Amino acid sequence: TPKDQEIKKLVDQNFKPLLEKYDVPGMAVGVIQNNKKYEMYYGLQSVQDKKAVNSNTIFELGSVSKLFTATAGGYAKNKGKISFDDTPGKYWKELKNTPIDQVNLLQLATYTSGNLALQFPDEVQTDQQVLTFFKDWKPKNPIGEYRQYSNPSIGLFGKVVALSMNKPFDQVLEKTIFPALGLKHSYVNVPKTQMQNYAFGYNQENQPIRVNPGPLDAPAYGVKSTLPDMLSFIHANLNPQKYPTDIQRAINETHQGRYQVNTMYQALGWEEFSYPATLQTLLDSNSEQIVMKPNKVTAISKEPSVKMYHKTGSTSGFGTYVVFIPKENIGLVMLTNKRIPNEERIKAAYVVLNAIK
Ligand SMILES: *[B]([O])([O])[C]([C]N1[C]=C(C([O])=O)N=N1)[N]C(=O)[C]SC1=NN=C([N])S1
Numbered sequence: 001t002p003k004d005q006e007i008k009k010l011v012d013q014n015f016k017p018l019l020e021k022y023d024v025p026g027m028a029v030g031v032i033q034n035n036k037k038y039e040m041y042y043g044l045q046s047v048q049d050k051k052a053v054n055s056n057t058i059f060e061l062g063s064v065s066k067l068f069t070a071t072a073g074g075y076a077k078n079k080g081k082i083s084f085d086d087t088p089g090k091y092w093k094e095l096k097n098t099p100i101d102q103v104n105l106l107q108l109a110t111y112t113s114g115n116l117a118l119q120f121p122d123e124v125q126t127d128q129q130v131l132t133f134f135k136d137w138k139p140k141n142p143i144g145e146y147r148q149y150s151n152p153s154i155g156l157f158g159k160v161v162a163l164s165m166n167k168p169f170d171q172v173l174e175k176t177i178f179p180a181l182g183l184k185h186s187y188v189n190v191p192k193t194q195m196q197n198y199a200f201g202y203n204q205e206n207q208p209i210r211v212n213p214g215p216l217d218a219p220a221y222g223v224k225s226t227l228p229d230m231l232s233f234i235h236a237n238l239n240p241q242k243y244p245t246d247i248q249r250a251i252n253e254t255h256q257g258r259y260q261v262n263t264m265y266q267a268l269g270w271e272e273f274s275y276p277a278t279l280q281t282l283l284d285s286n287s288e289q290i291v292m293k294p295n296k297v298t299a300i301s302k303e304p305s306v307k308m309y310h311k312t313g314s315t316s317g318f319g320t321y322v323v324f325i326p327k328e329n330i331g332l333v334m335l336t337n338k339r340i341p342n343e344e345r346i347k348a349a350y351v352v353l354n355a356i357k
Pocket residue numbers: 062063064151210211212214221291312313314315316317342
């Protein structure tokens with residue numbers, strides 16, 4: 001049996017059943033193998049409109065947006081606009097000589113400030129309130145020693161990256177990073193002319209919704225993209241030597257592991273693992289303990305010879321999973337317009353990628 005003919009069958013067997021299981025209106029699953037793209041579309045981007053999911057459908061990426069923030073940081077570092085040893089007050093002058101100005105940019109990007117939780121407080125909304133939050137910040141855990149997964153943390157990193165490139169963060173992605181990556185329909189702000197392609201998300205009561213504005217939302221969870229674009233992004237991560245040298249350096253930078261929390265290596269944005277990874281290793285990265293709680297980190301001891309990378313992302317109405325394995329030249333993207341459990345996304349991708357080899 002010609003093996004490429006099995007990719008569609010494998011994705012049908014492992015991803016399609018999730019639509020009925022979780023009452024998901026629409027899903028887009030892509031595989032890239034040996035530079036060939038496979039795109040599988042299911043269901044509806046809009047229930048009320050009876051509009052089909054296809055290659056023009058725009059989905060919210062949720063925390064997979066952090067991978068573009070990381071790539072923007074790697075790009076600015078290669079242009080010499082920042083050093084990861086700098087502190088945020090070098091760029092956001094109102095933070096200079098405040099306690100947060102003891103945390104360096106790598107520590108912000110990789111969640112080890114020692115006192116930043118997953119979300120800003122609900123009452124922090126305006127730019128002024130965001131600044132006040134960081135000026136009022138005081139340490140808790142020893143800086144650099146504890147990982148607590150955090151939108152404020154990588155959000156501040158993103159704001160600093162934009163300051164170093166003298167452009168607002170949305171313009172850094174839309175005018176510099178996305179074009180260098182060859183993405184055609186990736187947005188921080190979806191323009192009027194693409195709104196008809198923007199899927200509705202659906203909440204747990206199946207009501208149609210889209211992501212709401214929030215503080216430093218764009219660098220933490222505010223990018224929207226299509227399946228073809230996300231496959232191109234995976235392609236760039238699988239083969240950065242084909243891309244312009246500056247974006248090539250940026251991508252490499254996001255692949256470097258910085259520290260570990262047992263079997264999970266924290267890279268810039270990406271989570272990294274020894275390949276082959278056990279299923280439970282991949283599931284653990286999304287455990288309550290790793291996602292919601294502080295964990296003391298360690299230095300990398302085992303430097304994986306062959307690596308794989310992944311990232312989950314969610315908004316209230318959307319689920320995302322991306323995973324790639326350089327030495328197998330394969331990767332996978334899943335986009336849904338209703339959240340489904342992280343472990344389902346990870347497991348389905350594991351079965352598919354293992355069966356293709
Ligand atoms: B990110 O996706 O990791 C991040 C945090 N997170 C984790 C999960 C999970 O485990 O299901 N869900 N969220 N995502 C966000 O912070 C999204 S914030 C918002 N999403 N929709 C809004 N209207 S605000």
